[model samples]
Target: GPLGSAWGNLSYADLITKAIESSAEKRLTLSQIYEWMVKSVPYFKDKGDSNSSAGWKNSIRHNLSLHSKFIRVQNEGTGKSSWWMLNPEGGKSGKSPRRRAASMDNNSKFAKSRGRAAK
Candidate 1:
């Protein structure tokens, strides 16, 4: 017997939309969104941890920052992190950028070394 794709045709933005939508508050922090993926998306079952080619998280963040449907809001109690909710009118949108020390928050800096290497 064969199995269907775990993620099917859902793009990163679509994934975020689905994840945030199912939440009780209809919103999710970036971390919570990752939790949704890990718990709900079978493809992420084994990757429910602080890791990835960095691609999963990188791409998700990229989408969150790029899409207009996701709204970033200031948290009532926190240092720098923020919450993500669907933009009612915008229906989406893009970052205080939470990252570990050193490089700070690289939204898409990965492209600096791995893209269009054609010269």
Candidate 2:
């Protein structure tokens, strides 16, 4: 099974993890997040058609809204866009089993490279 094949359906939490890791700032604008998904997520690589990919894109937004771990911070430069980052606690909570694995590891390679915490 290849990376982008139908056999691999990434969960929303997983997508968020990938998106955050792809950003040097440890946080990313929604647009950048979408770009990361298209670049890194196999299923989204060639599914850019608005009509076909709407569902998944919507799910991405939906997950960001519902998941307390995905914090949305307003952009300081412009009132137009916002940046997203993993909760400092990394979404770890006894409240939801599904979220337990979504937390980011403080000592992960990507985290170390940032050399700073997410703002």
Candidate 3:
């Protein structure tokens, strides 16, 4: 048999986005996001140890912080951290990085390095 999404194929971006969208409130804290993936997605069920899932968690955190598609809003609770949600503008887009995602060196940092990147 072949490996399904549970075994492989889904990107971290896709997994994170899905988890965030799963809530009726349409937002989640970082911990909540982890919780969702642990129970809902089969891929992460066995990966939740102190140092076991470091890389996995790191990718999720990076996406939550760096991706503009996700937004962080202040939480009003007594001990709550910021809440994360999908951007209304880029919220519904699929996970292929959209060709413009994370183009951080926009101005001229790599203007000359663009050509023949395959070479």
> Is candidate 1 or 3 superior in TM-score?
3
What Cα-based lDDT does every candidate model obtain?
A: 0.75, 0.73, 0.75
lDDT of 2 by residue, 1-119 (tens): 44864537668877876677656577788788888878876668788777877786787888888866788878888957788888867653232122233555565455334555666
lDDT of 3 at 74: 84
How many steric clashes does model 2 contain?
A: 0
- On lDDT, the stronger of 1 and 2 is 1
TM-score list, all predictions: 0.63, 0.63, 0.64
Q: Candidate 2: where is the Cα deviation over 4 Å? A: 1-9, 91-119
Candidate 3, pairs of clashing residues:
none
Model 3 scores what on Cα lDDT? Answer: 0.75
Indicate the TM-score of model 2.
0.63
Runs in model 3 deviating more than 4 A are 1-8, 92-119
lDDT for each residue of candidate 3 in 46-112, tens digit (9 for 90 to 100): 7887887788788898877776688888888744667888886874644322233454554554434
Query: Where is the poorest 10-residue window by lDDT in model 1?
Result: 91-100
Q: How accurate is candidate 1 locally (lDDT)?
A: 0.75
